[PDB]
Ligand binder design. Structure first.
Ligand SMILES: Nc1ncnc2c1ncn2[C@@H]1O[C@H](COP(=O)(O)OP(=O)(O)O)[C@@H](O)[C@H]1O
Ligand SMILES: Nc1ncnc2c1ncn2[C@@H]1O[C@H](COP(=O)(O)OP(=O)(O)O)[C@@H](O)[C@H]1O
Ligand SMILES: Cc1cn([C@H]2C[C@H](O)[C@@H](COP(=O)(O)O)O2)c(=O)[nH]c1=O
Ligand SMILES: Cc1cn([C@H]2C[C@H](O)[C@@H](COP(=O)(O)O)O2)c(=O)[nH]c1=O
Ligand SMILES: [Mg+2]
Ligand SMILES: [Mg+2]
Ligand SMILES: [Mg+2]
Lengths: 202, 202
């Protein structure tokens, strides 16, 4: 009985890390086997450079840094498939969508070129998109103009009806948003998993 | 007056590094400005890991290592475009084709998925393919079966008539193959450059 692959997405400040941490805690307290993962995962060899990049300690050519973010997801694919096969539901703080939304926010980056590297990644069973006004996120790639461009790509990605997108009202309290996400998650773990793990964008 | 982008391709042992080195030397002695580059370029941050991988000092998930080879080309794109704009012809020992031929040689790697990361790279003005029997290369990804699979992909790539592919009989002596390549190169530098630098596979 496989685990569910559940991803949280949204702009900076939307609540993804807080709600990812709290989701894994609730699911585990309710007797599920569930573990947290995040992208980029700065602890691997590839991840160290993404961190540095993001921390503006290094300049990496724009297509090069896009590909390093994707390669960082692929290096975790064997772990990802192994844990899911063992019944472990994985809660993932950012995935390919952020990947495309942040690079696709840049000039001369077609969404098509940006999606290719991640074509074939484990397909999430549920994509939670933590929605909130930009000005509310800000009060909590990190500048106003860049966040608004990324949000636009996110909206272009959510037209892909092959994915199980759920909107979450991220402007509520931590606890209210958490209960919304918990209930959606329990449902995906119970029914969305009857089908074999899919492939992203293919 | 831009420089030409000239790439050499072929299986292991075909002569590419020897003929790349000798081409840059001849062109320079004939008053051209020309410089050598090679892929992977193991000296950058990304390149160190590819080297290690190839030297079997590290195991990198198959899609991850494919993307690192591509990212290694993209990080050199600003240098590449700058030198060409300054009139410097670049001789390149392996490029995107080897990239696709060696990953595309693996199981479950469509040529389509393998080409995407490199879509948009500077397009070579001339691709020299150093042709020779596998058994001759061998006497000089490195095993018989892997080389023959890569050669098959190379043949699938050469059907792309948008590229200026030239076959070179790599079974002749070093000097004979060199003169063949020199003459083809002088012609590309003199006429193939009247057009702006293109974009690979787009
Ligand atoms: N619902 C919420 N209401 C108010 N503040 C919140 C809420 N969710 C998270 N925060 C705060 O906002 C900041 C960003 O939260 P975080 O979960 O790190 O967001 P993200 O990972 O999406 O950037 C943190 O200080 C966090 O405590
Ligand atoms: N035309 C040739 N005939 C015989 N040996 C050759 C010829 N070209 C190169 N070699 C030898 O074959 C080996 C591989 O050459 P190299 O240029 O490194 O090939 P590649 O870079 O394609 O792997 C070297 O020892 C080289 O001296
Ligand atoms: C996962 C991912 C994140 N990003 C970005 C979004 C954030 O600005 C940044 C750090 O993410 P984080 O705040 O979730 O750690 O990296 C990319 O640009 N590409 C990617 O593939
Ligand atoms: C350029 C490139 C080479 N390769 C391979 C071909 C060789 O087996 C290896 C070393 O190349 P080399 O002998 O030209 O240094 O790397 C890839 O697998 N992908 C790539 O993008
Ligand atoms: Mg976060
Ligand atoms: Mg060589
Ligand atoms: Mg396509």
């Amino acid at each position: 009985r496989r685990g569910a692959l559940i991803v949280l997405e949204g702009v900076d400040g939307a609540g993804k890390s807080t709600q990812s941490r709290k989701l894994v805690e609730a699911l585990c307290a309710a007797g599920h086997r569930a573990e947290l993962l995040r992208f980029p995962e700065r602890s691997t060899e590839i991840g160290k450079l993404l961190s540095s990049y993001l921390q503006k300690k290094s300049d990496v050519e724009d297509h090069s840094v896009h590909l390093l973010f994707s390669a960082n997801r692929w290096e975790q694919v064997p772990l990802i498939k192994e844990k899911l096969s063992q019944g472990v539901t994985l809660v993932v703080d950012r995935y390919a969508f952020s990947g495309v939304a942040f690079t696709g926010a840049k000039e001369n980056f077609s969404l098509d070129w940006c999606k290719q590297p991640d074509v074939g990644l484990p397909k999430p069973d549920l994509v939670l998109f933590l929605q909130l006004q930009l000005a509310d996120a800000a009060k909590r790639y990190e500048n106003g103009a860049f966040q608004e461009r990324a949000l636009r790509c996110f909206h272009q990605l959510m037209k892909d009806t092959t994915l199980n997108w759920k909107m979450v009202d991220a402007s509520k309290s931590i606890e209210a948003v958490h209960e919304d996400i918990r209930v959606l998650s329990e449902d995906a773990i119970a029914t969305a998993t009857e089908k074999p793990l899919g492939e992203l964008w293919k």
